[PDB]
Structures are given as C-alpha cells and as structure tokens.
Amino acid sequence: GSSGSSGMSSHVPADMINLRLILVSGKTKEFLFSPNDSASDIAKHVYDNWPMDWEEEQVSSPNILRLIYQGRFLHGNVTLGALKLPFGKTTVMHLVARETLPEPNSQGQRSGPSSG
C-alpha cells in the first residue's frame, strides 16, 4: 500500500474576508466569507456549523438572527461586498438571537431628572 499527507497553511487570503464570530461572554472562532455573501449566508453558516449550542432551534429569519458589528447591527440584505471590507483581514462581530432588542437600553437617549 501507500500513504501521503502534505499541505499546511494558516493565513487568510486577499479574496476572502475573515470574520470573528463571538457569543455570550466570549468563545469565538475565525471564519471566512465572500463579498457576495450576505449576513444571511454568514448567520446561516454559523448556524449550520456546530451541533447545537442553544435550546431554541426551530426558526428561520434574519431578524431574530441579527449580526452585530462594532456594536451596531448589520442588515440581512447587507453583504461584505457592500461593506467594502478589506480582504485578508479580521473583523470583529457579535451574534445574538432575539426578534427584539437584547437589553432595555438604546443608544442616543437622554433622560430628564426631576431637578434643576
């Protein structure tokens, strides 16, 4: 018989965009995506990956599964391409599952305390 094994390389190309999928608390992993792929493909990919790390598992919507970037949220129709993101790089993004907001607190909101 015979056997062979040659091949090793750990570097992101300039045609793909490395994305960092983070979860609650922490735990993250480097991924790859195209500029023609939309948050869907990504969010989807993530879902497809891993066996199951979330009780809930019986939905299908880009809303519930929204991708966060730099704190903000990316649209489901948005695509790395439209994000004119730099190739051969690593982006940081957060993921969550909720048809609504995460916490009761929205940016750009001033309060008026009863006092002068």
From Swiss-Prot:
GO CC aspect terms: plasma membrane
Subcellular location: Cell membrane
Boundaries of every Ubiquitin-like domain copy: 17-95
Gene3D superfamilies cross-referenced by the UniProt entry: Phosphatidylinositol 3-kinase Catalytic Subunit, Chain A, domain 1
Chain segments annotated as transmembrane: none
InterPro entries noted in UniProt: MUB, Ubiquitin-like_dom, Ubiquitin-like_domsf, UBL3-like, UBL3-like_ubiquitin_dom, UBL3_Ubl_met
SUPFAM superfamilies attached to this UniProt entry: Ubiquitin-like
Keyword annotations of the record: Cell membrane, Lipoprotein, Membrane, Methylation, Palmitate, Prenylation
Topology versus the membrane: Lipid-anchor
Name of the protein in question: Ubiquitin-like protein 3
Organism of provenance: Mus musculus
